[PDB]
Structure formats: structure tokens, C-alpha cells
Amino acid sequence: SVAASQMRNALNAKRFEAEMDNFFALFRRFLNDKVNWDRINPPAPNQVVDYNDLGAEASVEFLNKLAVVKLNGGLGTSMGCVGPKSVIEVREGMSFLDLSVRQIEHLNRTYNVNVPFVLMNSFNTDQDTQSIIKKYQGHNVDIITFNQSRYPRIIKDSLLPAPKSFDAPLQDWYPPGHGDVFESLYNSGTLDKLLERGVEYIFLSNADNLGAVVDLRILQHMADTGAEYIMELTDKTKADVKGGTIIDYEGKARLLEIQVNEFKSIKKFKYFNTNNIWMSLRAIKRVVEENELEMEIIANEKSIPQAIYQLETAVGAAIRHFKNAHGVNVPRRRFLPVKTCSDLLLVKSDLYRLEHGQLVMDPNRFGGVPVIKLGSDFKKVSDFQKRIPSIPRIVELDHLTITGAVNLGRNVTLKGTVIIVATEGSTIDIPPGSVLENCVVQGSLRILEH
Amino acid sequence: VNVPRRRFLPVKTCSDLLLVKSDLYRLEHGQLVMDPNRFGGVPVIKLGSDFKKVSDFQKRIPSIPRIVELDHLTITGAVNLGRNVTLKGTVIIVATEGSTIDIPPGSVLENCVVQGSLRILEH
Amino acid sequence: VNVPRRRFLPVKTCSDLLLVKSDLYRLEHGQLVMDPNRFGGVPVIKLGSDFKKVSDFQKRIPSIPRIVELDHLTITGAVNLGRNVTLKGTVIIVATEGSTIDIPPGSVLENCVVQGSLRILEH
Amino acid sequence: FLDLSVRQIEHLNRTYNVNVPFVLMNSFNTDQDTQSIIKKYQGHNVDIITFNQSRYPRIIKDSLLPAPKSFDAPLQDWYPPGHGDVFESLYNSGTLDKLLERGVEYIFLSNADNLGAVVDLRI
Amino acid sequence: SVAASQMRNALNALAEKKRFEAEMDNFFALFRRFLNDKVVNWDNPPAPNQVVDYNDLGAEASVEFLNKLAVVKLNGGLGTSMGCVGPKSVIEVREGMSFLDLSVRQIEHLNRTYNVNVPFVLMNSFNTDQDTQSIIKKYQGHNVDIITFNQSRYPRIIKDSLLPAPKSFDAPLQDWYPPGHGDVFESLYNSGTLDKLLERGVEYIFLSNADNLGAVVDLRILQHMADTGAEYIMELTDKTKADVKGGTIIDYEGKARLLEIAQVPKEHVNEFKSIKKFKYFNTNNIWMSLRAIKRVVEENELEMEIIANEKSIPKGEADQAIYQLETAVGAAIRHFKNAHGVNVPRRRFLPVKTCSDLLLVKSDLYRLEHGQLVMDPNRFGGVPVIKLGSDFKKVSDFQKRIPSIPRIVELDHLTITGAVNLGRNVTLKGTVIIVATEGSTIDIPPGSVLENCVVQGSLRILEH
Ligand SMILES: [Cl-]
Ligand SMILES: [Cl-]
């Protein structure tokens, strides 16, 4: 069918023409696409370096060449918050954005430097971010902002743009993937602005990820092998069977998620992508200009209150086109993301101390990180804090499940495996000071003021 | 001497019996032989006090569910499993104080908490 | 003239829609053609008021159950069917006043009355 | 468990043309029931030897005296000591000598509970 | 394995004129064939030849032939399980009449209608013989030649020693058991009953469960038997849906046997329970030549599919584990000159196993006529299907909760679960499902009409 077509200009009512071109190229390779175990072997001992087999923190000369980029296009709507996810409170008054800025201040003050802090926004988050940013006026911090691409959603049945006009309402548009960094850095001018200041290196991170802290040893290791791309990897726990993993397919290392599922084994294929990515800013400038990008397109279907396709890209995809792309195997303290109020309970717990805008785990914690499974009555932050106003003691916890309307009193201690299931319709009030260990708790109990 | 776990397969409870009677094992020359396709270690099985007696265990679980792909199972209260039930990932089933749950034959349960009270009677 | 029933196949309710979207029929030159292996007549289907609107019917039955071998299906109250449910013979499902029944994916229900309450939550 | 254990000795016996002695350490709770059930293995080429472990008296916590008055005091006031009573029981019963007389130099010890405790020639 | 030896030697318990040497021999022969597998090459349905349509049969027998018939009823079964003490046959069915009463009334008629005297034989067991000897006295003075005999008393085998459970001959009733319905052949013979019937010119016996109300002498089937010199006919009726378990007729090779699901492998079972292709099941209404029976036992060509049952019997202690091993009357069909089966209407299969069956048989669906239950001629469909739950198991409980039998002409299907009480003059039509909520009672008001409905919950009706 091919079906040439295309809103040649929408309204065409400045550049924008530039973004639409990048879209038409994702659309073309979509119609052509709709997997292979050729040399899908595990990664070689060279292409995954142990963090413990690195030395020597970088100098200051090198640190003066680093910029920090945080993905900040995401809304807080899954945790029932309006506005950007980064503005959500994490602990002791501090948001994700607050902790990130505090981290740049400490670094700046410790080494007498001024590391630029760059925020990639979207039309959902840029403006809210412009307003909240003002609270960091006065602190010695260089905050730069840019907007990623705004692509039109495709109607599934007509396969035409959902928007008629340029000023068609925000329902018919979407921000593409995390992989839109490359084109957005460039098209916005941010790439040049950083180069003009002698930035050669960027450390890229989700605003979600409390543990993505500048590490001078991995900055050294990068430059002292002129590798243009490093990916932090950590180790699959049972909680990570999903999500991308590193593969040495041919000699050119790639990574994959998708028969062609024996890799679900924690043995054989044992490391996954944190999305903590270090890159050469110069490498990024050419791969964009030589049009050598062409990344695995991902197509998502949704329903705009009309059914549509999205079509996005992933930052992991690009790894092929980079002069010595390998990966580094880091402790889990560098992968501490917050996607749900389950993650919030962990991160606010007695398991962590706040030091210079970083979460520091209790050195007495025996095992790995406790697994926490809260039900839908804890989905909204406002509901989570109504029901769990004081975070239980969870050193010695392995596993927690809570379903239905459950309220925890102050200074509750959880050990081992704990399952609490409130009866359909009923509330359970767990008394203050309760010690629960290796138990299933069930029923319906109210505690009222006498 | 540090031996594989196939040499440590003791049976202290009807939880252990559910493991040992499952599709995870074949009987060969009076030995239990584990499925070579089993991905991880041995599934963890936590049955409550309504399964303590062998006679009760077999009244409620007359046909052993399919438990390759199972990591974790908890069942509390009066729960009956139909034939050819498949359990994957983590599965928690909690019958309400006093109530029975009849899990329909052929049910596929994966990474879920199941709760309530449901009877299945012959029409 | 006294015609076979294949010439009377009206669609007045979402009950009729469940029949006509099922594995009982193939689309051939713009005609619905019944499976030639179908033993009896057309199955009788009654869905209650929670299935009146097409939007509600598809929220609760997103994947049409397998109904060759079905004679009689009645469903009352808030009932959700998982994917690849098989119904045979007579099946009666009655949710308790105010409650939901989630029928697990893969359930085979044959010649049975199902009654009560059951929630299946993502872990 | 006993059936699987005997089947394991038969296979071994048949595979290597040998007759490995199979010894059961009983207690006053189990010796007699075991004597009766053992009879079903008559006919199969299997050397089944039986012995009884120690029967010690329970100490009353307050008097710190024996709970039993007589030797024929009821079975409530006695108990079989630990699994560690093998050494003294092997010896005192004569089983230790009986095995030595047959050129047994080695014993492989196991819980009847443990399905996976199979003779391993490498170890 | 040998091992036998110990059994054979132990079978000299013989702890007095009348002996049982004969029975023990018949046992040792069942024990030997047991130790063999201690398969069936799934290879076809029955030929058009080995199944005659009752509607494709020729006229009623003469009187000459009727003077050659004897009637035998299986009467070893207790009423324990319907919570009744003594033999099932003594339980009241309707309007004051027991199973035995209806059977005798049937012979009295028949005798009077044809001026004959058909012998009526009761096969008892040590559980039922003595109670039946006492009850049978009430038929003194009516017509009817009533003969009784006792079946075999075999010893239960200890599972672990494979020796007899009884030490003495006077060891208590716990260690012994009456074998199957298939013990007829050896019991007829060993008791002398076979000869006594032959001496009176019987030639043919019609065999039946006492509990099957519809197993009535049929002159057309008596003719068809003799007027084809067939030595064995089995009545078959049609599998409905409540019948999938229990024997069906098979033309294995060129002859006829039948397969009960017990002797069928793990797979294929699903093709064997198809209501199409197999079509028919065994009523246990069996016609046989008494002469055929005399040789098959004497030439020792019996060898019937052995059925092995496990139990736990009690002294001063607890319990010990045993095998039974019985035989089925259906099994023998192989050894009989022109063994076929006849496809009879369902009115000839009306058994009473549960209080569900009692509700049917006491209902307005049936009238009592010359000791037969006769269905309302206006009844549209087949026999209604009735399922009552555990609160209706014992006769005493059934009558506490259903004192006045509901009107069930126009009923297709009734199921009742939990504590349900019916008021007087309740009418049930179509499909009715009643489910009391766990722990609760439903009182259905007097005069209720329930049609094509599910009734669920709780309802109490209290005297003001
Ligand atoms: Cl007698
Ligand atoms: Cl006589």
C-alpha cells in the first residue's frame, strides 16, 4: 500500500519543520518493521568491567569537563500527583530536584568548581519547571533547561496525524522516548552551549534515580580508555527479570528486552541497564550530523478519550555507533529509582540516612534491599501518607505485601516475610509498636480514640 | 562435601509433599529426578494449618497444580484447587475468616493476591 | 415457510453480541457460518444489567470465552472474565449483592453454579 | 518413603550384582509397626536389618527425678533420645559387630524423610 | 511371586458336618490371579447384531415358557448409608409398601393372571440372611413360592502379610466379607439352589437388584431369549448424562464382553464416555440359562475380571489394612452361547440408591398398579434429574425437611444444597436450583410455585 500521504505542513503556523522530519523517519521504518539468536551469546569479560577493578578518581581538570543531564519530562500522575515527578517530596522536606541540586552544590564546594546541571523537559513539564527552578536562585549552581521533541499521535485507523492545527490541544501530541536526547540536545542548541564552555563529557540519569551520583573513578575509567559511551549495569535480582540486558552480539555490543526466554535465568545473563549512561558530547554531535542514528523503533498503543500509536526510541538502542562502547558493573546503591509509593516507603525508611543530598544505606543491613508490594489503596502519595504517616522499622525485612485498607501505627517493626490482607470492604488498624515476623495477618480491626 | 540440593529433599510438612508430588519431578528407579527445564531453584511453598493433615491436604488438593515457573506460594484458610491449575511467579490466596475459596479448574494465577469467598457446586 | 434457525439470528442485547463474536461462528462472504462440529442448537445466553452498555460489556469481557460445547450461560452482578475462559454445558455465575467475581484466566467451568466474591489483584 | 528406599537398594543390587545391607534404626514408638510392614518386602533380593535405639526416662522439672516409677510405666513418661543415639544403639544392640562380621567397613546415614539421600559411589 | 504357600496352608482354619472347604477353594483361585499384576489393547463399539431393539421383538411367551422361569433378586445390600438398619429391600418405598412387598405383589399377580406358580428366589449375605428369614414370614398365606440362599463368606486379606485377617472360623464379622454380585454362580451351585430349580423344570432365571423397582418379568424378552437359544441376555437402556460411570457393551474380537471404567487405562477415557458411538449401559437386568450356569462353574471356566478393594477394619487397639477382591455378574458374559444385549426403555431401570431417588418414586409422577410404579401417561419428557445434598442423606432427615413431597410433573431438573425445608403443596417446574447460604436455613413457604429459577440466601418462617 505504501500510502505516500503526509500533513506536508500541519498549520506550519519557528523551526518545527526540523522535528516533523525526524518523525516521518520513525514513521517510515514503522511501516517496514511489521529478533534472532545468531550470536546472542553472553557479554565478554572485557565488555563488562567490575567497579572494584577501577582505580584513581579524576583530577578537577577532568571534572571541569563534565556536565550533568537529568531526564525531567515525566509527570507524577501514576503516583496521583499533578506536575513533574521530580517535584514530589522524597524525605525530610527534599524533592528529587532538591536532592539533585544539593548534590551539585556539595561537588562545587568540595572541589571549587561549577558543574553545569541540565534538565531535559517536555511540553508537559517545561513551564512548571521554569517556575519551581526560581527557588535555587542564590545558591552557586548553573541550571540550564531545554525542551525535547513534541510529535503528533497517529490515529490507528486512518494512520494520519491526530492534530489538525499547530495549536491543537495537548491530547493529540506526545513527547517521544528518553532516546530523543540526541536530537533535542542538538536542535535546541544545548549541545553547542556545553561545547563553548569546554564540556566534553555528559553523565545522563533519570530524575527518578536517587543513586545516580557523579563518580570520579568511572569518569577517569571513561577518558583513560577514550570510550565514547559507558552504561552502568548492576546484577539481576528476582525483581529485574524484565528490562534491558547487555549482549556482545558479533563483536559490536548491543542490548535487548524481547522466543530466540532462557536468559530470564539469573545465571548465564546476569546484568541489567541502570540507565546511568556516560557519553562523549563530541561523539553525540557527529552520529546526529552523519544521520548514523536509526534506532530500534518502539510502537505503543493507547486511547485518547480514538485509538492511537505513539512510536518512541530508547537511549540504550544507540550503543552500536560509539568508539569503544562497554558497560561497568556497579553496586545497587547507584540504582535506587522511585516509580511507585512502594519505592517511596523504602527510601523514607530507617534503612537510609541523608548525607550531602545522597541516600546512604545502613552498614548493618544484612541482605539485599527488601521487596515491598503495596496495593492500589497506596497508589496516590496523599493516600500513602494518610495510612502510613510514620514509616515502619524495616531493617531485617525480606518481603512485605499489603492489600486493602490497612493503617500502620507509629514504630511498627516488620521482619522476614509479612503479608497483611484486609477483607473486601474492611479496614485493619495495626496497633502502634506491633512486631510482625514471618506471618499472614487478616481480618478487620478498628482502633478509635476512647 | 558441598553437594547439589537434589541430595537434600526432606519432607517435614504437607507443603514439602506438594513439591515432591508435582510435575517438577519424575520417579526413576526409586529416585526423584527434577525437570531439566526448571529455570531457578526449588519453589517456596507455605500452606496454612487447614493443610496440616495429609487427609485434609488431599481432600483440598486432589490434583497437584503445575508449578514449573512458580517462585513463591502462600495459601491460608479453606481453599480448594480444581484440576490443572497453573501457578507462576508469586501467588498469595487468603480465604476470609470462615469462608471457602474454590479455585476453578484450569485457573492460571501469576504474580497476584487472590481473596474472598467463592463456592462452585454441581449444577 | 418453516426455515432453519440460522435465518433468525438477531442482535438486541450484548448477550447476542457475545454469541456472534464467539468461536461458534466464522465470517464467510459477509455471512456468519456456524462451526459444522457444533452438536446442539444455538446456546442460550443471559447477561444482567452490568452488561447492558457495549462499553461495559467489553470492560468486563475483553476476550470472548470459548463457547462451543456451551448449552446455557447466565451471569448476574459484577462479573469479570479473564482471557481464554472455556464454558461447557450449563454455567450459572451469581456475584453476591454488591461484590465482584473475577474469573481467573484459563478457567474451565462445566455444569456448575458459581456464587460469592473473588478479587484478583496484581501483586 | 520406605518403599522408595527399598526400590533404591534393589536397583543398586541388580545393577552391580551385589547385596548391600539396609539397616533401620527404630524407637519403641516405631519398632513393631516396622516389623509388621517390613513383611511386604519378602521375596525381593534385599537384606533388611532392624534395631531399637535407647528408651530414656523423662525428668520431672520440679523434683528432677524420673517420671516413670516401674519398667512397665506407660509410654508417656519415656522418650527416644536424639539422632545422636546411633553410636550407643549400633553398639549396645550388637548391630555394629553383625555389620563388621559381613565385611562392612563403611555406613551412609540418612533420615527416612530425605528422598534425595541416594548412595553416591564418587563420595 | 510364589508366597501363596503361606495363604494355602493358613486356609486350613477349619475350626462340623457342614463345611466351607468349597468356598475357600474358589477364593484361592481369585487370590492366585490377583498376584498377577498385584492393560487393554484399546481395540470397538458393539455390532448391530449384539444389541436388539426392544421394539424389534416378537410376541409374549405362552405359559409353557413362563412355567420354565424363576425370578432371582440380589438382597445382600444393607440400608446403612440411607441411615437405615437391616436390608435395603425392607425399606418403605411408597403407600406402606417395601421393595420386597412390591416384588411379592408382582409374583401374586402374574401367578393369578396366567394360573402359574413362578418361584421367587432371594440371594442373601451373612449381613441380610436372618433378618430376611424373619420378615419373609409375613408372605405366609398368599400364593408365591419363596426360596432363600446365602452367598459366600470369604476372608479379608491383611495387606502386609497377605494372610487371612481371621484366625478362627468364629472370628468376628469384621474380618470376613460377602464377595460381589458375581458370587451368584458359585452360590447357586454350592448352596444346592441350582439343582432344586432344575428339579422343578425352571431352565431360565431373570436376575435383578431388589432396589430396581422397574425390573419386572417381560414375556417378550423371555420369548426372544428361548426363541434364539441365547444363554445370556443383558438389558441396556441408553447413556443420558447421570450414567457415564458404569459398564457398557463391547464386541472385542467377534464375541461380546463389557468394560467398566476400572479396567480402562489413564488415556482414551473421554472417548469411552461419549454419549455418541457407545450409546448404551448395563441395567443389571440379566436373563441366563440355568443349564449354561451349571457347566461354566463345573468345568471351572469362570475366571472373571477380579476387582480389588482396600479398607481399614478395627480388640482394644485401633485399625489394620486389608484387600477384599470381589467379582461382577457382567464379567462372565464371555462364556455363554450367543451372549448379546437388548435395548430396553428406561422404565425398566428405576433404582433407589439415595433419598433423591425416594423423592421421585414417592411423587405424583407415579401410581401403584399391581405392585408396579406406573408413570403418569401425560408426563412430557424423560425422568426428571434430582440432586439433594448431604442434609438429605438419611431417610429420617429427608422426611424431617420434606414431609409433603412437592408436585413434580413438569419438573426437568431439581438441585438443593444446604439446610432447606419445603412447606406443604410446593410445585416445581422446569429447572429449579435452591442454595442455602453457608450455615443458614431456607424455609420455602407452603404453596410456592418455583419455575426456571435460582433461589439463594436465608429465610426463616416462625409461628407467630
Ligand atoms: Cl444356605
Ligand atoms: Cl421349591
Question: What DSSP assignment string belongs to E341-361?
Answer: EEE--GGG--B--SHHHHHHH
Q: How many residues does chain B have?
A: 123
- The cell numbers describing B52, all together, are 496440616
Other CB atoms within 10 A of residue C66 CB: 16
Beta bridge partners of C110: C88
Looking at the structure, do residues E320 and E437 belong to the same domain, yes or no? no
Chain A residues touching chain B at CB-CB below 8 Å:
238, 262, 264-266, 375, 401, 403-404, 419, 421, 423-424, 440, 442-443
Of E206, E242, E214, the residue nearest E352 (C-alpha): E214
Chain E residues touching chain C at CB-CB below 8 Å:
415, 433, 435, 454, 456
- The cell numbers describing C50, all together, are 452490568
In a 10 Å sphere around its CB, with 0-12 CB exposed, 13-18 middle and 19+ buried, how is residue A266 labelled? Answer: middle
Other CB atoms within 10 A of residue A375 CB: 20
Contact A282, A185 (CB under 8 A): no
- The cell numbers describing E226, all together, are 428361548
Contact A417, A397 (CB under 8 A): no
Residue in the structure block whose three cell numbers are 476512647: A450
Instruction: Tell me the CA–centroid distance for residue E306 and ligand 1, in Å.
Output: 24
CA distances from D58 to A278, D63, D72, D86, D87 (A): 71, 12, 14, 19, 21
Spatial separation of the C-alpha atoms in residues A346 and A373, rounded to whole Å: 11
* Residues of chain B neighbouring A423 (CB-CB closer than 8 A): 96-97, 115
Chains that touch E (3 or more CB pairs under 8 A): B, C, D
Spatial separation of the C-alpha atoms in residues E151 and E169, rounded to whole Å: 16
Looking at the structure, do residues E169 and E270 belong to the same domain, yes or no? yes
Looking at the structure, do residues A439 and A328 belong to the same domain, yes or no? no
Of the residues E353, E387, E394, E400, only one is catalytic, namely E353
Domains of chain E: total: 2
Spatial separation of the C-alpha atoms in residues A286 and A229, rounded to whole Å: 14
From the CB coordinates, do chains E and A have 3 or more pairs under 8 Å? no
CA distances from E213 to D29, E119, E287, E346, E357 (A): 54, 19, 17, 11, 11
Q: Which of A282, A312, A338 is the last residue of a domain?
A: A338
Of A360, A342, A343, A340, the residue nearest A351 (C-alpha): A360
Looking at the structure, do residues E33 and E60 belong to the same domain, yes or no? yes
Do the bridges between strand C44-47 and strand C70-76 make them parallel or antiparallel, or are there none, so unpaired? parallel
All residues at 6 or more sequence positions from A152 whose CB lies less than 8 Å from its CB, including other chains: A7, A10, A23, A161, A162, A163, A172, A173
Spatial separation of the C-alpha atoms in residues E377 and D122, rounded to whole Å: 82
Kindly give the residue spans of alpha helices, DSSP state H, lying in A15-154. Answer: 17-33, 96-111, 128-132
- The cell numbers describing A298, all together, are 518502539
Active site residue E400: no
**DSSP code of A224?**
T
**DSSP code of E59?**
P
DSSP string, A166-197: SS--TTSEE---GGGHHHHHHHHTHHHHHHHT
Spatial separation of the C-alpha atoms in residues E388 and E405, rounded to whole Å: 13
- The cell numbers describing A53, all together, are 577493578
C94 with E456: Cβ contact below 8 A:
yes
Of A377, A387, A391, A376, the residue nearest A344 (C-alpha): A391
Task: Give the dihedral of Cα atoms A44, A50, A56, A62; nearest 10 deg.
Answer: 70
Spatial separation of the C-alpha atoms in residues A164 and A162, rounded to whole Å: 7
Start-to-end CA distance of chain C, whole Å, equals: 59
Tell me phi and psi for residue A326, to 5 degrees.
Answer: -125, -170
Spatial separation of the C-alpha atoms in residues E350 and E373, rounded to whole Å: 9
CA distances from B105 to B63, B70, B81, D60 (A): 10, 18, 7, 53
Point out the residue among B3, B6, B29 whose CB comes nearest to the CB of D11.
B29
In a 10 Å sphere around its CB, with 0-12 CB exposed, 13-18 middle and 19+ buried, how is residue E247 labelled? Answer: buried
DSSP string, A391-427: PPB-TTEEEEEEESEEEE-SS-EEEEEEEEEE-TT-E
Of A58, A9, A394, the residue nearest A222 (C-alpha): A58
Tell me phi and psi for residue B104, to 5 degrees.
Answer: -55, 145
Start-to-end CA distance of chain B, whole Å, equals: 58
Spatial separation of the C-alpha atoms in residues D74 and D86, rounded to whole Å: 24
- The cell numbers describing E421, all together, are 425445608
Spatial separation of the C-alpha atoms in residues E61 and E222, rounded to whole Å: 6
Of E408, E400, E50, E371, the residue nearest E216 (C-alpha): E371
Contact E169, E143 (CB under 8 A): no
D5 with B30: Cβ contact below 8 A:
yes
Q: Annotate A317-345 with three-state secondary structure.
A: HHHHHCCCCEEEECCHHHCCCCCCHHHHH
Rg (C-alpha) for chain C, rounded Å, is 15
Spatial separation of the C-alpha atoms in residues E448 and E453, rounded to whole Å: 12
Contact A136, A101 (CB under 8 A): yes
Spatial separation of the C-alpha atoms in residues C61 and C103, rounded to whole Å: 10
Run of H or E including E103: helix E99-114
- The cell numbers describing E189, all together, are 451351585
Do the bridges between strand D78-79 and strand E51-53 make them parallel or antiparallel, or are there none, so unpaired? unpaired
Looking at the structure, do residues A276 and A344 belong to the same domain, yes or no? no
* Residues of chain C neighbouring A424 (CB-CB closer than 8 A): 99, 117, 119
Spatial separation of the C-alpha atoms in residues C79 and C77, rounded to whole Å: 6
Instruction: Tell me the CA–centroid distance for residue E61 and ligand 1, in Å.
Output: 32
Spatial separation of the C-alpha atoms in residues E150 and E189, rounded to whole Å: 11
Start-to-end CA distance of chain A, whole Å, equals: 75
Other CB atoms within 10 A of residue D37 CB: 15
Looking at the structure, do residues E52 and E19 belong to the same domain, yes or no? yes
All residues at 6 or more sequence positions from B38 whose CB lies less than 8 Å from its CB, including other chains: B24, B68
Spatial separation of the C-alpha atoms in residues A444 and A424, rounded to whole Å: 10
Distance of CA A108 to the CA centre of its chain: 24
- The cell numbers describing E190, all together, are 454350592
Q: Resolution in angstroms, to 1 decimal, for this deposition?
A: 2.6
Other CB atoms within 10 A of residue C28 CB: 8
Encode burial over A315-332: b for 16+ CB neighbours within 10 A, e otherwise: bbbbbbbbeebbbbbbee
CA distances from E90 to E78, E93, E108 (A): 9, 9, 18
DSSP string, A194-217: HHHTT--EEEEEETT-TT----HH
Do the bridges between strand A326-329 and strand A245-247 make them parallel or antiparallel, or are there none, so unpaired? unpaired
Percent helix, percent strand, percent coil in chain D, to nearest 5: 35, 15, 55
Other CB atoms within 10 A of residue A359 CB: 20
Chain E residues touching chain B at CB-CB below 8 Å:
387, 415, 417, 433, 435, 438
Q: How many residues does chain C have?
A: 123
Residue in the structure block whose three cell numbers are 546484568: A271
Residue in the structure block whose three cell numbers are 468394560: E259
Tell me phi and psi for residue B37, to 5 degrees.
Answer: -85, -15
B11 with D1: Cβ contact below 8 A:
yes
Q: Which residue of E has its CA nearest to B122?
A: E415
B99 with E435: Cβ contact below 8 A:
no
Spatial separation of the C-alpha atoms in residues A107 and A102, rounded to whole Å: 9
Beta bridge partners of C119: B115
- The cell numbers describing D42, all together, are 519378602
Encode burial over E76-109: b for 16+ CB neighbours within 10 A, e otherwise: bbebeebebebbbbbbebbeebbbbbbbbbbbbb
Run of H or E including A383: helix A381-387
Run of H or E including D3: helix D2-16
Q: Which of A338, A355, A390 is the last residue of a domain?
A: A338
Q: How many residues does chain D have?
A: 123
* Residues of chain E neighbouring B100 (CB-CB closer than 8 A): 438
Of B52, B25, B50, the residue nearest B36 (C-alpha): B25
B74 with A262: Cβ contact below 8 A:
no
Spatial separation of the C-alpha atoms in residues E193 and E207, rounded to whole Å: 14
Of E364, E376, E433, E375, the residue nearest E405 (C-alpha): E364
All residues at 6 or more sequence positions from E113 whose CB lies less than 8 Å from its CB, including other chains: none
Residue in the structure block whose three cell numbers are 560509539: A322
CA distances from E294 to E121, E124, E203 (A): 17, 20, 11
Spatial separation of the C-alpha atoms in residues E241 and E372, rounded to whole Å: 26
Q: Which of E298, E327, E352 is the last residue of a domain?
A: E352
Instruction: Tell me the CA–centroid distance for residue E162 and ligand 1, in Å.
Output: 29
Run of H or E including A155: strand A154-155
Spatial separation of the C-alpha atoms in residues A319 and A250, rounded to whole Å: 14
In a 10 Å sphere around its CB, with 0-12 CB exposed, 13-18 middle and 19+ buried, how is residue A157 labelled? Answer: exposed
Question: Using alpha carbons only, what angle is made at residue E107 by residues E105 and E109, rounded to the nearest 5 degrees?
Answer: 70
Looking at the structure, do residues E227 and E214 belong to the same domain, yes or no? yes
Please give the single-letter amino acid code of residue E393: K
Distance of CA A356 to the CA centre of its chain: 21
* Residues of chain D neighbouring E1 (CB-CB closer than 8 A): 43
Spatial separation of the C-alpha atoms in residues E22 and E194, rounded to whole Å: 16
Other CB atoms within 10 A of residue E10 CB: 15
Q: Annotate A368-382 with three-state secondary structure.
A: CCCEEEECHHHCCHH
Chains that touch C (3 or more CB pairs under 8 A): A, B, E
E3 with D43: Cβ contact below 8 A:
yes
Torsion sign (Cα): D53, D55, D58, D64? negative
Spatial separation of the C-alpha atoms in residues A438 and A418, rounded to whole Å: 6
Please give the single-letter amino acid code of residue E106: Q
B118 with C117: Cβ contact below 8 A:
yes
Instruction: Tell me the CA–centroid distance for residue E97 and ligand 2, in Å.
Output: 25
All residues at 6 or more sequence positions from D9 whose CB lies less than 8 Å from its CB, including other chains: D20, D22, D46
Helix, strand or coil, per DSSP, at residue A133: helix
- The cell numbers describing B77, all together, are 484458610
Spatial separation of the C-alpha atoms in residues A306 and A303, rounded to whole Å: 6
Do the bridges between strand E427-436 and strand E411-417 make them parallel or antiparallel, or are there none, so unpaired? parallel
Run of H or E including E250: strand E248-250
Kindly give the residue spans of alpha helices, DSSP state H, lying in A202-313. Answer: 216-223, 281-289
Contact C105, C61 (CB under 8 A): no
Other CB atoms within 10 A of residue A47 CB: 16
Domain range enclosing C97: 12-123
Other CB atoms within 10 A of residue A409 CB: 16
HSE of E202 in the Cβ direction (CA atoms, 13 Å)? 28
Helix, strand or coil, per DSSP, at residue A24: helix
Spatial separation of the C-alpha atoms in residues A235 and A245, rounded to whole Å: 9
Contact A84, A122 (CB under 8 A): no
Do the bridges between strand B44-47 and strand B25-28 make them parallel or antiparallel, or are there none, so unpaired? unpaired
